[PDB]
Amino acid sequence: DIVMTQSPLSLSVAPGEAASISCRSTQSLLNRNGDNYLEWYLRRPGRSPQLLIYLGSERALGVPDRFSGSGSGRDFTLKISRVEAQDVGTYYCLQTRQGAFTFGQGTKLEIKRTVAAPSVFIFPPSDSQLKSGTASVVCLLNNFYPREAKVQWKVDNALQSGNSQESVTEQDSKDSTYSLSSTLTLSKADYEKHKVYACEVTHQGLSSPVTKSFNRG
Amino acid sequence: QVQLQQWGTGLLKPSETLSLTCAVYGVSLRGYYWTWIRQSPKKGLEWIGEIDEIGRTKYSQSLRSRATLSIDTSKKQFSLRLTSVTAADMATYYCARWRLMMVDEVTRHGMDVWSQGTMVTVSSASTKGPSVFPLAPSSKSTSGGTAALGCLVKDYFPEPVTVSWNSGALTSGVHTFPAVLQSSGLYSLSSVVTVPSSSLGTQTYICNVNHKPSNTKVDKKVEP
């Protein structure tokens, strides 16, 4: 019944600048000595949680000097002095005082890097899939920033809605770029009916929408 | 060099029982507390319970009714059982090792080691094997020196699918995208890799898909 609320839900910080994730508990986590029962965990993209801070301020083993917990009582602040590309992921605060053992909301750290542009590639359907009775055309957007992008599918210059599903990787822990994969799926017969299938990509880094197309069908 | 390995039920039908077990390699279970922590968007990050080497247990009140933590120091493996699995029990599950230090009170120094994670899906759907299709390089796929190819894991249930390239040799530029859940209730996933265009034809690129719930491991060749 101890609730942990973290202040910045999402944070984009430039490489070299400081971040300050804040945490708050309904009840004081203090003990007689003065130590607080708070621990900080970092879940990197794709990995399991790691331990950063324990007992409010003590760094874990292998945790760089940048990570530094502080605070007493109910309010607590995890500070990273110099954010780097590796620091991407969602951060949590945990109370160990009163046996509910409740975590915090979570907080995504994102690296505000240089505006980049998607390397757009388009893949026509496999011969095996056509034999299977379905056809899937893939569009790939590789290593771009920011995350926000638009990928519209146009068959014979006719925008198509409801036949595609897209997926976006998380920020690369090295170059802080994203990648996107959109898959237009439809019947084998419906794929024979139309000719050209194009993937129109809209991004901030691009001057104008970029379109890629294959024409067999 | 401490390794915590998790196995158990990856797919449950509603009201059935969850079994998850963590084998510790490297250290004896003696001297630590052992906790199961689950993660889901509905529940967030949630503490289920911890266990001792003696057998003493601490549970969350909500899950106390249907949770049983066990331990076997000789076999160096502890387990969590969750009964009457509901749609709120579908989550990723981790096992952790607490680090504790005694100064007139058991103080806790954090969960130093965590597990790989085991996705547990609560659904009535039957296990379906994936279909692997090659996304091939072409003039459209190539962009200057960089060339793009891919492997499409079309239709599978439940979620766990692992994709490696060239039997793990190729990790440079390998992007495995999060899967998408189709209207049909099955998943779809794409893994791609950006190689130098000169490598096409001469090099041999293969994508290894492994869907353990269906016991389906396929190696597919990507030909330009």
Author numbering:
A (entry chain B): 1 to 217
B (entry chain A): 1 to 224
Passage from the reporting paper:
While the primary way out of the HIV-1 epidemic is an effective vaccine, the development of such preventives is marked by frequent setbacks, largely due to the inherently high mutation rates of HIV-1 genomes and the immune evasion capacity of the viral envelope glycoprotein (Env), which is the sole target of host humoral immune response and thus the focus of HIV-1 vaccine design. Despite its essential role in mediating HIV-1 host entry, most antigenic surfaces on Env are either hypervariable or cloaked by an evolving glycan shield. We also solve a 4.1 Å cryo-EM structure of CRF01_AE Env in complex with F6, the first bNAb from CRF01_AE-infected individuals.
To facilitate the model building process, we also solved a 3.3 Å crystal structure of bNAb F6 alone. This structure and the X18 UFO structure solved in this study were then docked into the EM map and further refined to generate the atomic model of the X18 UFO-F6 complex.
